[PDB]
Amino acid sequence: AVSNIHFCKDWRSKVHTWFKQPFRKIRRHQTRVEKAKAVFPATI
Amino acid sequence: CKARCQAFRKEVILRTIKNHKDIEAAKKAVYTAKKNAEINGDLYAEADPKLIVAIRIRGINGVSPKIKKILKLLRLRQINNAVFIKANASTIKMLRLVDPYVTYGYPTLETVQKLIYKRGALKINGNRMPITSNCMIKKALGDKDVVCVDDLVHEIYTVGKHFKEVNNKLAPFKLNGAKIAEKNKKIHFILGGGFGNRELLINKLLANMI
Amino acid sequence: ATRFRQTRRRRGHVSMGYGRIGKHRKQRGGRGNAGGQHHRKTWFTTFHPDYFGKHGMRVFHLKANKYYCPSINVDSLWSLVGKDVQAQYKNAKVGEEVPVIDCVKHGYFKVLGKGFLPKQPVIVRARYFSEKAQQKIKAVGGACELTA
Amino acid sequence: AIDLDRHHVRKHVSKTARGNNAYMKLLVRLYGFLARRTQSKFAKTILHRLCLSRVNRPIVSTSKLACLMKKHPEETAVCVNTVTYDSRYPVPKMNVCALKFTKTAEAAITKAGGKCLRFDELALKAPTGRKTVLIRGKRNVREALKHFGKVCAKKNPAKQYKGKQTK
Amino acid sequence: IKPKIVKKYTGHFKRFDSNRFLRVKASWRVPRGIDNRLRRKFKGTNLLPKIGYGSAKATRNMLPCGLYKFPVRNTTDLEMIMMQNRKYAAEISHAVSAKKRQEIIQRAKILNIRVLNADARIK
Amino acid sequence: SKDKNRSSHNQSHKAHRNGFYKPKKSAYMSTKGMNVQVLKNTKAQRKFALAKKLEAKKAA
Amino acid sequence: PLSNGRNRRTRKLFKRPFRGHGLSNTSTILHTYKVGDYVTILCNSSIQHGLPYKAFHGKTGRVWNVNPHAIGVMVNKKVNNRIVVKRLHISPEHIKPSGCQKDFLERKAAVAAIRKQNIQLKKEGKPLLPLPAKRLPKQPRPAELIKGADIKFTTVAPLKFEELY
RNA sequence: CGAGAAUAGAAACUCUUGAAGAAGUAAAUUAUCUACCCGUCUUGAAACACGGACCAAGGAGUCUAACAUGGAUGCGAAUGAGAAUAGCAGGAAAGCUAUAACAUGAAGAGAAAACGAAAAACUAUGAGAGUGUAGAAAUACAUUUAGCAAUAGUAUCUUUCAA
RNA sequence: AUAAACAUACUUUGAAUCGGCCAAGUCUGGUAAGCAGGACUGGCGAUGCGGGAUGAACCGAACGUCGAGAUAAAGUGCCAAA
RNA sequence: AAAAUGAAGACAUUUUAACGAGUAAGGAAACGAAAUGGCGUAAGGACAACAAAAGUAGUAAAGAUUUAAAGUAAUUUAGAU
């Protein structure tokens, strides 16, 4: 199989690790929780 | 239970009696015909031998490709390995192409016996089992009507109708070492060497090699 | 699992499994698919003969949503609704109710004819039909509708 | 030294159930003792096929068992492999015995009136094998087989592992 | 009862070129060099550890006393070989203190178990 | 820096390690390129025997 | 160093037999080759059209297919370490009917003659004949007498040297 | 004279040395035999070929991304759905639940429009399973039945100018 | 005729290698070479051991650790077993 | 390699036979009759006096210098300072 790999360019500076994903889920869930509290038809 | 062992021994005794008749009766007719031919002034032409015993002489290093295959078909895959070979126009020619690696003559009944009694072996289930009984020979060679060890020695000596089946079953004998030559083993026995046809002078070499 | 590699068993070997006469120099014939027509021609000929060249017209902006047309053979039409429903209506005829195997709902547009349908009247509703599919459905005693 | 054609190396035939499946290690113990004692070629055949890798134990769809057991009414099909379901064709009444029955293949066989034996119940019922139809599914249907060889060849090409600039 | 423990080689297989240099330790490492005097098995220097040197299976790992070795850390380990006091001999580990040793040594007398460290860490 | 151009030394003992791979008996039974008249008689009979065989199978 | 020509090294391989020039016979174009016969390829340099490759000259092959003007012949060709199957189409002028099975096809007749008698002797109850003995290499001759009435002797000794000039 | 066979018969010992150190092993020296410098390029190095004064610590096939073959595993015309993302208890960079877009696959060829598979298959060899006879033990023979996998060839069918 | 069930047929994946050298009851260019280039076969390379005092190829013969015996090449005035 | 036996014995079982030199290179882990067998360093999850005080350690750990034993070998164990 003929390889097609686009690593010739710079890639180590074009990486995006997803380590914040466990904490993004919490951050948004603590926004809806604190948005329905203000006025509930806000998050409706 | 074990009353068939008693009856089996009688059959082996009966077969040894009959087997020694063929060897002795054929020996008498050869000598009787030699006396009658001397008296009458005729000449006698002795019959050609039927059995050839070949011994590997050299090692395994430096063998030509075709000669290497002929020795394998003769089952001489090791040095000092003696086998019994049928003699006709083919094996005699095959034993001539590989002469520098074999020495072969003709065995007497006193030599066939010593090799099979002392260095005998059989291939049962693929294992080279040394001969230790007749129930072992009967189990392997019952269908070839060879039930004892004097039936095995007789068939080899006279080259019977079931010689090929008996011959391949016997494993190639592993023999000792002994003085092969007067000069060296690089010249024919005719020139006082080691290899080549030795006729009835192979029994002398096999006597010190068994 | 770096204790399972070949380096852990090839410790003590000087060449490290890469040969003394020809060492493990960096490059062994370019970088990537270099030399496609000069010294690796025996590769792109033995293992990818049609790699080099041009064939076919150019679709400047292909719209892959207009070539989309999943197909279901006739033998698999009855498995959309089930094997219980097939047996329930196994004695139906013309005039009485028969199930409609709406293929478009399940994501199959075309209906092809391959294999054999059970000998029961059946209604098939799908966007496109094959010439030998319609014969197979009709010969069994069914109907072939169209949708959209 | 001795001149031999080739030296003694390991024989390329398996004799145990591979992996650590503590249930497959029992059937081989069970069928490796029935083959030795009964000396029946059916048990040697069953033992031999239980020690084959996954790619050499191809599945037998229920429509293959149906068309193979059409003329064998009272028989117990014996396939040493998984038995899947052919959702396009009906499943008649038959007694089967396999290493693993797929959920829909097990429910379909027993719905029509059949039975789904394991390999322990078969040895108890017919150890030597008396009313069995030995079956094994197709082996050349694998997709990996197409690509083997050189595609450029003139007689039987391969199928050219796809990649860059494919056409 | 004791079978004669027969050894096919009673020496040590020292590393090649360890009697000249100090960076080369006396632990065996088979030479892989092309011109090595030893891996070609030249005469005079042809000593390598080959599986033929392995001692007899019946008397392998057997101490000269005729009993195999069994290490114990506490008095409760002794019970693991209280049935086989004619095959195994206790050997108290080197970390067990001088107080727990007199518990093991005395208990080994009760169960009649030979102990190879009966004079270790004595006062 | 010249070199040895060619030598058949050892090239024949190599080929006899894995011996000459003979062709299978299926290779001697190909029917490609045969007489067009013979291949039309053989096809015209195989169709005739098959039609009478399948009809008998359907009858039973 | 030789060349890559198709018919290279053919000064003595394609030369016609001495006093054998000109036309071929009329049984060359009249023998009937049926599928399955053993024929020998023999390149004929008089007829250039369709001359088989010089590496097949003298090889023995099996007629596999008989075409109106050419006889299909298949032979085994040797490659690097494998033997392949070659399927030529040789005109009858370039091939000769091989008699490799000349001996074999006369042993079959001898056995078939005997087996024909065994189906008659058995029907009429006579003891059936035994099949012919198999072929064996030259066996060691037995012992035979020699009469002393028609005999004569010639002494044999090394010869005294006689000069050749 | 006497094989087989039937019946009767017979093998338990002695001396020397050793807790004053037996046998075995280890260390040093002597004595006969044996022994050229390790690593590497090389057809060939102990080489008058190159690095090496000695010692300690460090020191070189690793990580990610794409494809493929094979060994183990789950499910199987489906598999995955730890795709984002949304909930649960517990406080949790862990654990559980999401009838869910989509990836590979279930259908193949054609540059493309346009299309889209059965004669409910045939032939050959082939894995098994019973029965009886006999050597009489394993095992050999005769006969009824079965056609899986695999290989080759066949009819039939979809697409292509062309299979 | 003889040999062949750890027989026979393979399939998939893959490593190393394509600087070679020597012998000859052989050949070509050369006056000739321990030169250059070849055909068939065995070796050194990749290989120790007994012998040729020493020697990559010569002769014997290819190796797990040993004990006892007949051996092979070749030797039997001393070094040196006879 | 072939037979025998096989829920746990033990030494990776028992019997018979053949075999064992080798640079480059290969033989990943698991696979009861095991589709090669193992030694060592560091870190993580478990197990370690089974009658409710449950691996070793101030009655002297790790380390260092030696002496003996086991293993063909990688190395392990123990005594003394």
Swiss-Prot record, chain C:
GO cellular component term of the entry, any: endoplasmic reticulum
Alphabetical list of Gene3D superfamilies matching this protein: 3.100.10.10
Subcellular location: Cytoplasm, Cytosol; Cytoplasm; Endoplasmic reticulum
Major location category of this protein: cytoplasm
One MF annotation (Gene Ontology) recorded for this entry: structural constituent of ribosome
Keyword set includes Aminoacyl-tRNA synthetase: no
Pfam families in the cross-refs: Ribosomal_L27A
GO biological processes: translation
Segments for region (Disordered): 20-39
Keyword entries, A-Z: Cytoplasm, Endoplasmic reticulum, Ribonucleoprotein, Ribosomal protein
Presence of the UniProt keyword Signal in the record: no
Leader sequence segment: none
Family: Belongs to the universal ribosomal protein uL15 family.
Listed HAMAP family: Ribosomal_uL15
Described function: Component of the large ribosomal subunit. The ribosome is a large ribonucleoprotein complex responsible for the synthesis of proteins in the cell.
Subunit structure: Component of the large ribosomal subunit.
UniProt name for this protein: Large ribosomal subunit protein uL15A
Organism of provenance: Entamoeba histolytica (strain ATCC 30459 / HM-1:IMSS / ABRM)
